[PDB]
Amino acid sequence: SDYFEEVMRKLTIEDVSILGWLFQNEANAVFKAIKKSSIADELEYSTANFRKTLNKLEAIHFIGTVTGGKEHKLYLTEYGQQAVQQAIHH
Amino acid sequence: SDYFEEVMRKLTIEDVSILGWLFQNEANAVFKAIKKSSIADELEYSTANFRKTLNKLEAIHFIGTVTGGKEHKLYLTEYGQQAVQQAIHH
Protein backbone atom coordinates (compact mmCIF):
# COMPACT_ATOMS: atom_id res chain seq x y z
CA SER A 1 0.00 0.00 0.00
CA ASP A 2 2.83 2.37 0.79
CA TYR A 3 4.71 0.37 -1.87
CA PHE A 4 1.60 -0.15 -3.96
CA GLU A 5 0.85 3.51 -4.12
CA GLU A 6 4.45 4.01 -5.08
CA VAL A 7 3.84 1.85 -8.09
CA MET A 8 0.55 3.66 -8.67
CA ARG A 9 2.28 7.00 -8.81
CA LYS A 10 4.83 5.93 -11.43
CA LEU A 11 2.18 4.90 -14.00
CA THR A 12 2.70 6.20 -17.55
CA ILE A 13 -0.15 7.16 -19.85
CA GLU A 14 0.36 4.01 -21.91
CA ASP A 15 -0.02 2.06 -18.67
CA VAL A 16 -3.34 3.60 -17.74
CA SER A 17 -4.73 3.53 -21.30
CA ILE A 18 -4.35 -0.20 -21.58
CA LEU A 19 -5.62 -0.87 -18.06
CA GLY A 20 -8.63 1.32 -18.49
CA TRP A 21 -9.41 -0.34 -21.75
CA LEU A 22 -9.21 -3.92 -20.45
CA PHE A 23 -11.42 -2.67 -17.65
CA GLN A 24 -13.96 -1.06 -19.94
CA ASN A 25 -13.94 -4.38 -21.81
CA GLU A 26 -14.39 -6.17 -18.50
CA ALA A 27 -11.32 -8.35 -19.13
CA ASN A 28 -10.85 -9.14 -15.43
CA ALA A 29 -10.52 -12.97 -15.39
CA VAL A 30 -8.92 -15.70 -17.52
CA PHE A 31 -12.12 -16.64 -19.31
CA LYS A 32 -12.82 -12.88 -19.79
CA ALA A 33 -9.33 -12.32 -21.24
CA ILE A 34 -8.77 -10.41 -24.53
CA LYS A 35 -6.32 -10.87 -27.46
CA LYS A 36 -3.53 -8.31 -27.56
CA SER A 37 -4.40 -7.35 -31.14
CA SER A 38 -7.92 -6.34 -30.22
CA ILE A 39 -6.45 -3.74 -27.85
CA ALA A 40 -3.60 -2.69 -30.11
CA ASP A 41 -6.03 -1.97 -32.93
CA GLU A 42 -7.96 0.33 -30.64
CA LEU A 43 -4.96 2.29 -29.42
CA GLU A 44 -2.68 3.94 -31.91
CA TYR A 45 0.70 3.09 -30.41
CA SER A 46 4.03 1.93 -31.63
CA THR A 47 5.24 -1.62 -31.14
CA ALA A 48 8.33 -1.49 -28.96
CA ASN A 49 6.29 1.13 -27.08
CA PHE A 50 3.19 -1.07 -26.77
CA ARG A 51 5.42 -4.06 -26.03
CA LYS A 52 7.37 -2.21 -23.35
CA THR A 53 4.12 -1.29 -21.68
CA LEU A 54 2.85 -4.90 -21.55
CA ASN A 55 6.22 -6.02 -20.28
CA LYS A 56 6.03 -3.55 -17.39
CA LEU A 57 2.32 -4.00 -16.58
CA GLU A 58 2.85 -7.74 -16.37
CA ALA A 59 6.12 -7.36 -14.46
CA ILE A 60 4.42 -5.31 -11.72
CA HIS A 61 1.71 -7.94 -11.65
CA PHE A 62 -1.16 -5.72 -12.79
CA ILE A 63 -2.23 -7.96 -15.70
CA GLY A 64 -2.47 -11.60 -16.54
CA THR A 65 -1.52 -13.28 -19.77
CA VAL A 66 -3.17 -16.33 -21.18
CA THR A 67 -0.89 -18.26 -23.50
CA GLY A 68 -1.56 -21.42 -25.52
CA GLY A 69 -1.75 -21.14 -29.28
CA LYS A 70 -3.36 -18.40 -31.38
CA GLU A 71 -2.63 -14.95 -30.04
CA HIS A 72 -2.09 -13.99 -26.43
CA LYS A 73 -4.97 -12.76 -24.24
CA LEU A 74 -4.91 -10.39 -21.26
CA TYR A 75 -6.83 -9.81 -18.04
CA LEU A 76 -6.58 -7.41 -15.12
CA THR A 77 -5.24 -9.03 -11.97
CA GLU A 78 -6.54 -8.22 -8.49
CA TYR A 79 -3.99 -5.43 -8.17
CA GLY A 80 -4.43 -4.31 -11.76
CA GLN A 81 -8.08 -3.90 -11.05
CA GLN A 82 -7.47 -1.75 -7.95
CA ALA A 83 -5.26 0.52 -10.02
CA VAL A 84 -8.17 1.31 -12.28
CA GLN A 85 -10.90 1.88 -9.69
CA GLN A 86 -8.40 4.17 -8.06
CA ALA A 87 -6.72 6.15 -10.89
CA ILE A 88 -9.65 6.52 -13.32
CA HIS A 89 -12.46 7.01 -10.76
CA HIS A 90 -11.02 8.82 -7.74
CA SER B 1 2.42 -5.50 1.80
CA ASP B 2 -0.25 -7.91 0.62
CA TYR B 3 0.71 -6.60 -2.85
CA PHE B 4 4.36 -6.21 -1.92
CA GLU B 5 4.65 -9.77 -0.75
CA GLU B 6 2.98 -10.76 -3.95
CA VAL B 7 5.83 -9.17 -5.82
CA MET B 8 8.25 -10.71 -3.35
CA ARG B 9 6.92 -14.19 -4.10
CA LYS B 10 7.33 -13.85 -7.86
CA LEU B 11 11.08 -13.20 -7.66
CA THR B 12 13.35 -15.14 -10.06
CA ILE B 13 16.86 -16.27 -9.13
CA GLU B 14 18.32 -13.64 -11.48
CA ASP B 15 16.29 -11.14 -9.48
CA VAL B 16 17.63 -12.10 -6.12
CA SER B 17 21.22 -12.60 -7.32
CA ILE B 18 21.55 -9.04 -8.53
CA LEU B 19 19.76 -7.57 -5.49
CA GLY B 20 21.84 -9.50 -3.03
CA TRP B 21 24.96 -8.46 -4.84
CA LEU B 22 24.17 -4.74 -4.84
CA PHE B 23 23.37 -5.20 -1.18
CA GLN B 24 26.61 -6.98 -0.40
CA ASN B 25 28.29 -4.12 -2.25
CA GLU B 26 26.25 -1.68 -0.14
CA ALA B 27 24.88 0.02 -3.29
CA ASN B 28 21.85 1.45 -1.48
CA ALA B 29 21.98 5.18 -2.43
CA VAL B 30 22.77 7.32 -5.49
CA PHE B 31 26.27 8.12 -4.36
CA LYS B 32 26.76 4.45 -3.44
CA ALA B 33 25.55 3.37 -6.91
CA ILE B 34 27.51 0.84 -9.04
CA LYS B 35 28.12 0.52 -12.79
CA LYS B 36 26.20 -2.30 -14.50
CA SER B 37 29.38 -3.82 -15.88
CA SER B 38 30.92 -4.32 -12.45
CA ILE B 39 27.93 -6.53 -11.58
CA ALA B 40 27.70 -8.25 -14.98
CA ASP B 41 31.33 -9.30 -14.73
CA GLU B 42 30.66 -10.89 -11.38
CA LEU B 43 27.61 -12.83 -12.52
CA GLU B 44 27.85 -15.19 -15.46
CA TYR B 45 24.60 -14.41 -17.24
CA SER B 46 23.47 -13.75 -20.71
CA THR B 47 22.62 -10.29 -22.00
CA ALA B 48 18.92 -10.27 -22.94
CA ASN B 49 18.63 -12.36 -19.73
CA PHE B 50 20.61 -9.89 -17.62
CA ARG B 51 18.85 -7.04 -19.46
CA LYS B 52 15.40 -8.48 -18.88
CA THR B 53 16.19 -8.76 -15.21
CA LEU B 54 17.25 -5.12 -14.88
CA ASN B 55 14.18 -4.07 -16.81
CA LYS B 56 11.91 -5.92 -14.38
CA LEU B 57 13.76 -4.99 -11.17
CA GLU B 58 13.58 -1.32 -12.16
CA ALA B 59 9.96 -1.65 -13.32
CA ILE B 60 8.86 -2.97 -9.96
CA HIS B 61 10.80 -0.07 -8.43
CA PHE B 62 13.28 -2.23 -6.51
CA ILE B 63 16.37 -0.51 -7.91
CA GLY B 64 17.49 2.89 -8.97
CA THR B 65 19.42 3.92 -12.01
CA VAL B 66 21.81 6.81 -12.19
CA THR B 67 22.27 8.08 -15.71
CA GLY B 68 24.55 10.77 -17.14
CA GLY B 69 27.47 9.76 -19.32
CA LYS B 70 29.85 6.81 -18.89
CA GLU B 71 28.03 3.60 -17.99
CA HIS B 72 24.87 3.35 -15.87
CA LYS B 73 24.99 2.84 -12.11
CA LEU B 74 22.50 1.09 -9.84
CA TYR B 75 21.29 1.28 -6.26
CA LEU B 76 18.75 -0.53 -4.20
CA THR B 77 15.64 1.50 -3.54
CA GLU B 78 13.78 1.51 -0.19
CA TYR B 79 11.67 -1.36 -1.44
CA GLY B 80 14.55 -3.16 -3.14
CA GLN B 81 16.36 -3.09 0.17
CA GLN B 82 13.42 -4.59 2.09
CA ALA B 83 13.33 -7.44 -0.46
CA VAL B 84 16.86 -8.38 0.50
CA GLN B 85 16.62 -8.19 4.30
CA GLN B 86 13.58 -10.36 3.85
CA ALA B 87 14.44 -12.96 1.19
CA ILE B 88 18.14 -13.54 1.96
CA HIS B 89 18.00 -13.27 5.77
CA HIS B 90 14.62 -14.60 6.95
UniProtKB/Swiss-Prot annotation, chains A, B:
Which InterPro entries does the UniProt entry name for this protein? Answer: WH-like_DNA-bd_sf, WH_DNA-bd_sf
Q: What Gene3D superfamilies does this protein's entry cite? A: Winged helix-like DNA-binding domain superfamily/Winged helix DNA-binding domain
Among the GO molecular function terms of this UniProt record, one is: DNA binding
Q: Which GO terms describe its biological process?
A: plasmid partitioning
Q: What does this protein do?
A: A DNA-binding protein that is part of the type III plasmid partition system used to ensure correct segregation of the pBM400 plasmid. Binds the plasmid origin of replication, probably cooperatively, forming a ring or short helix with external DNA. Its effect on RNA expression has not been shown.
Under the subunit heading, UniProt states: Homodimer. Dimers bind to DNA, forming a protein-bound filament which may form a helix around the TubZ filament.
Q: Which UniProt keywords apply?
A: DNA-binding, Plasmid, Plasmid partition
The answer to whether the entry has keyword Protein biosynthesis is no
Q: What is the lineage of its organism?
A: Bacteria, Bacillati, Bacillota, Bacilli, Bacillales
Q: List the signal peptide residues.
A: none
- By what name is this protein known? DNA-binding protein TubR
